[PDB]
Amino acid sequence: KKLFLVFWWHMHQPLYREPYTGEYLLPWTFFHAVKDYYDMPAYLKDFEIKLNFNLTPVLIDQIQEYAQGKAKDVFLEAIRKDPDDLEKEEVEKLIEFTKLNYEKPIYRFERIRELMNKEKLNREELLDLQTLNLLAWCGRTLRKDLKDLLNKGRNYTQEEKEYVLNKYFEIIKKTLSIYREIKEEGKGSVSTSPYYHPLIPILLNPNCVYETTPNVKIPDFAVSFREDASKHVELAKEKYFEIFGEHPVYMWPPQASVSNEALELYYEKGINMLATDEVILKNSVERASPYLRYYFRELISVFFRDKTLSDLIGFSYHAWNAEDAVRDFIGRLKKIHESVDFQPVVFVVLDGENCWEYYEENGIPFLEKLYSTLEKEEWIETLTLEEAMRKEDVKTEVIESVKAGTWFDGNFLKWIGNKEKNEYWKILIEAKKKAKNDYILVAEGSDWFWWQGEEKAPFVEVFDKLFRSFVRRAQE
């Protein structure tokens, strides 16, 4: 009697490439590529477990651009430059970026503390600010190779900065290949999402917000996004075919978002299985065990993730010692294992690149201890998505209807509802009336609405600039 454990790490970035200048206006795709996107599947090289991954096609596009040397990244150019050639604006954006990440454990360098107490920086101090920002995002693989430079902590030269950059781009160049390798070796399944990570339920039927938040105000959806919804899925199938050689049979719905109509569309497009959130299941069915494989209308397989276990990694364990956190995690799986007489399937699903920056040492002590302890447990069998879809000694249930929602409170309020987010949908709706190319699909990505209508934060202007630029470009 085994507990079946399914890790599904979801990787995504919206398109930071501004369509008129061709410039990557934020460096987040680069920094999460060198820190997490290669290194997360790379754990499978050292640990005999199964781990699954989601790669959005818009993320894949940017990884390709960086890997091929075509990405003009404005922040990264400020990093690469000799400090004597830095513009005042570039120094300000460098300092701004440091302040934003300053309290995170991966930025725990004494020299960063010294430099941010300084009101004017010379060439050597700017070289340290540039290079330590690079090194703060160093992933597990290169933290071994670059350990001498990392322990330095200060006094970096342009030659050393350039060396780190060359190693980082080598990491990026091998990133798509290692997803292909762990997939071909059976160490994990790889899924994708509709192309630009949109909210498929809203594009299909904006009225589905009223299944959870009946009081919410939405704009006049005077155009249909239903065909655009199909296009996100179809284009995603094409990009996945290019990278991995098959049409995808697993998809992660952006924000875990599902509806009766969205599940229909996924089935119609040949998706055999997806996962969503436990809150959906609780909102939809009275007797709701998340340890079963569900069949929506006998059309498509649905797993409901263990929200508690997913939220321990995403939200709790960063503030713990690695050893305490893994003993807690295994202790919870043991109680699940001891709680039922059948073999439960336990889906752990969350973003794969966003939580580790808040852990000590980028979560490497935690994940190494976690994966080491998992592979020693005889009563735990980690599964690929393919193995979870096919496993016969697993309990099964049919569900006929779900309440539309997301894994954020089970509703859509993080992307629609208040004046400012609704203004984005107004802009999108008007632009869709006049759209002439697929940049309208880029503007349907969920990220733009997430950051809109929120307390002012540094760089929120860039997401707004990107969204409006994609909207403008879509109509030309």
Ligand X SMILES: OC[C@H]1O[C@H](O[C@H]2[C@H](O)[C@@H](O)[C@@H](O[C@H]3[C@H](O)[C@@H](O)[C@@H](O[C@H]4[C@H](O)[C@@H](O)[C@@H](O)O[C@@H]4CO)O[C@@H]3CO)O[C@@H]2CO)[C@H](O)[C@@H](O)[C@@H]1O
Ligand Y SMILES: OC[C@H]1O[C@H](O[C@H]2[C@H](O)[C@@H](O)[C@@H](O[C@H]3[C@H](O)[C@@H](O)[C@@H](O[C@H]4[C@H](O)[C@@H](O)[C@@H](O[C@H]5[C@H](O)[C@@H](O)[C@@H](O)O[C@@H]5CO)O[C@@H]4CO)O[C@@H]3CO)O[C@@H]2CO)[C@H](O)[C@@H](O)[C@@H]1O
Task: Indicate whether 315 belongs to the interface with ligand X (CB under 6 A).
Answer: yes
Q: Which of residues 11-50 bind ligand Y (CB under 6 A)?
A: 12-14, 28, 32
**Looking at the DSSP assignment, which residues form a beta bridge with residue 54?**
10, 191
How far apart are alpha carbons 288 and 279 in whole angstroms? Answer: 10
* Beta-strand pair 250-251/190-191: unpaired
> What are the b/e assignments for 158-189, b being 16+ CB within 10 Å?
eebbeebbebbbebbeebbebbebbbeeebbb
Contact 209, 412 (CB under 8 A): yes
Task: Indicate whether 316 belongs to the interface with ligand Y (CB under 6 A).
Answer: no
Q: How far is the CB of 456 from ligand Y (least distance, A)?
A: 8
Task: Indicate whether 361 belongs to the interface with ligand X (CB under 6 A).
Answer: no
DSSP 264-298: HHHHHTT--EEEE-HHHHHHH-SS--TTSEEEETT
Q: 3-state SS string over 165-233?
A: HHHHHHHHHCHHHHHHHHHHCCCCCEEECCCCCECHHHHHCHHHHHHCCCCCCCCCCCCCCHHHHHHHH
Specify the residue, 12 or 231, whose C-beta has the smaller distance to ligand Y: 12
Task: Indicate whether 409 belongs to the interface with ligand X (CB under 6 A).
Answer: yes
Specify the residue, 101 or 475, whose C-beta has the smaller distance to ligand X: 101
Query: Could you say which of 61, 261, 351, 430 contacts ligand Y (CB under 6 A)?
Result: 351
Structure token pair of residue 40: 């997360």
- Which of ligand X, ligand Y, none does residue 355 bind to, with CB < 5 to 8 Å depending on kind? ligand X
Q: How far is the CB of 338 from ligand Y (least distance, A)?
A: 32
Query: Could you say which of 450, 464, 472, 475 contacts ligand Y (CB under 6 A)?
Result: 450
Specify the residue, 128 or 353, whose C-beta has the smaller distance to ligand Y: 353
Query: Could you say which of 354, 372, 373, 475 contacts ligand X (CB under 6 A)?
Result: 354
Q: How far is the CB of 311 from ligand X (least distance, A)?
A: 5
Q: How far is the CB of 373 from ligand Y (least distance, A)?
A: 26
How far apart are alpha carbons 210 and 218 in whole angstroms? Answer: 10
Draw the binding track, 283-312, toward ligand X (x: CB under 6 A; -: no contact). Answer: ------------------------x--xx-
Q: Which of residues 47-106 bind ligand Y (CB under 6 A)?
A: 100
Structure token pair of residue 80: 């690469």
Contact 232, 194 (CB under 8 A): yes
Task: Indicate whether 183 belongs to the interface with ligand X (CB under 6 A).
Answer: no
Nearest to 391 by CA among 344, 433, 329: 344
Count interface residues toward ligand Y (CB under 6 A): 17
Nearest to 57 by CA among 313, 237, 261: 237
Query: Could you say which of 61, 181, 351, 438 contacts ligand X (CB under 6 A)?
Result: 351
Residues near ligand X (CB under 6 A): 307, 310-311, 314-315, 318, 350-351, 354-355, 358, 407-409
Residues near ligand Y (CB under 6 A): 10, 12-14, 28, 32, 100, 255, 351, 353-354, 446-447, 450, 455, 457, 459
